Every structure is written in structure tokens, then in C-alpha cells.
Amino acid sequence: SIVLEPIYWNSSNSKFLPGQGLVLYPQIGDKLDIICPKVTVQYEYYKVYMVDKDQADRCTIKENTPLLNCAKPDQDIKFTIKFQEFSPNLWGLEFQKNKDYYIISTSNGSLEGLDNQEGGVCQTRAMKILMKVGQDAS
Template sequence: MRNKIAQEHLSPPEYLRHFVPPRSIHRRHHHHHPNTIQIYWNSTNELFSLSSSQSTAILYVHLGDKVDFICPKSMNPLYDPVEYNSLYIVSKDAYRQCYSSNYKPLIRCNRPFETQIYTMTISNFLPYPDAIEFHEQQEYYFISTSNGDIEGIDQKYDGLCRTKNMKLIMDVQKYYNHYSSIPNLTSNLLSILSTKMKSA
């Protein structure tokens, strides 16, 4: 199931370069050039629509990488839909149950006609007091419990996490992954995204 999902989406969407099945990941070298990975944090992102209640979007990153969470932006206020949401990093239990009542948002996407970006450095050092400390071989959990409306941007349960499966697991790796089993991979790979089945 995982490999089939990955192989059907080899034409890269705008927000990523390539889908790869997890079994195609090979850790053959220990050299890693840090990347900046962009995640469009909106409920219409194919990353979430490809998932279901029993499958989860996973982002593989490495120590030294940076991740930009890009808020929804409406280019035309008359015709484009507007979405408001908040981004949370939560515990595994909160991730599974779609609640954020004990957490502060990393960013509130409340200006849909402006560019809002939350940049996160994947590091096990804390450059400033509020920075998040990451460790290799660990997973981190991101959700949005907003309902998409401005009135529900601070909603603390369910919301888009439940209705649109708007949640993400970040899997931190130590070394750069090199690939040999999938042809025509770009050498400037920005992100590695796949889906894997999670038990309910």
C-alpha cells in the first residue's frame, strides 16, 4: 500500500520534489548538505489529502536542515478561498487525538493576504530560549486544530486535524539519504515525503 501510493505520485506537486517509498531510502554516506524544506501549511495541500485517518504524512529531515512552514495565502481576496489556522507541535497522544489545549501555537496564520512563514532549524542545540531541541532518530508531531475560519483559529480540539487530516510527523535523521533505486532523482532534493500506515 505504501509503495503503491508513492509510485503513483512521481509527478512532483508544487510543494515537493519527489515522493519515495520508505524502502527506497538508503543511508550509504554520512555526508549531508543542509536543505531548506518548504511545507505549505494549508488544508488543501495534497500532502494531507493523500493521507487518510489510517495513514499519516511523514517528513524526513536531518540535523542541520531548516523547515519553512508557509501559511495559507490568498492572492485574490474576491475569488480565492481564505483559510486561517494555527500550527502546533504536540505530543504523540495529542497528535493522535487532535487536541492542542496544553500547547502554544508556533505561528498563527491570521493574515491570509500576506506572506507568513515559520522557520524551524532542525538542531540539537538551542540558539535562543524558545527554540525547539531536536534529536536524531526521534519523531515530532505537528497538527492544526483550527477550523479554518478566523473565529476558530484558536480552537483547541479536532478542527482541520480531524476533518482534513491536517497533521504531520517529522522524522529526524542524522545523515543524508542517498537514493539509487529510483531513476532520474534531482540532485537538489528539497524534501522527502511519504505516507505510511498507522494503526488506529
């Protein structure tokens, strides 16, 4: 229960259906792990943010802070999201049933373009995650 099965943020992840990213239907109480594993020893540099539908579609980024600053190739980077309406923590994310939340990255994937604010990996590999909190799948 609750533990939702980690979601490796890495182009090789088949779950990122190219052109439509990966869609999820997490419910309240559900826990989720976005992971950026190490290396083996080619590492994909990313700066993962959570954004509104606007920025989600037509991949652009803007005070818009990374949940994952995948830039440490020797160790694992990870953000465990807790799908709760009311957060026991003040600096902790909160959700609401029947709302969508989007997580994208506009990085080239390479260290070179880790700060790209436009398109990037998202636009290409379609590394976006749409979470339809408390909703089924048509």
C-alpha cells in the same frame, strides 16, 4: 542542502496525505519552512502547534503555543524550523536524532473556529505533520 523545501500549510496541499497527514524524515542541520501564504483576493485560518504523540493522535490541543498564527490573509505567515540538537538560541526549539515530532492544527480552517481545542482541520483533512528526525522510510 539543508534547505528542505517549504511546506505550505493549506488544505489544497496534496502532500498532506488525507488520513495520515504528511510524514517527513528531516535530519540534524536541516532547515524547514512552514508557510501560510497570502491571497487572488477563501483564506484558511489556522493556529499551528507542535505537540507530543498524545495530542498528535486523537487531535486535541491545550502552554501549547502556535508556531504559526495564520490569521493575516493579506501577508504570508511563516515559521522556519531548524533541526538542531543544541540550539545557539535559548528560546529556540531543539531536536534529537531518532525521535518523532508532531505538528497539528485543530482549527476549523475558518476564522470562526480558530481557537477550537478539539479535532478540527486535523481530524478532517488530516493536516498533521509527523517528522521522523534522522530516520529512513520503511
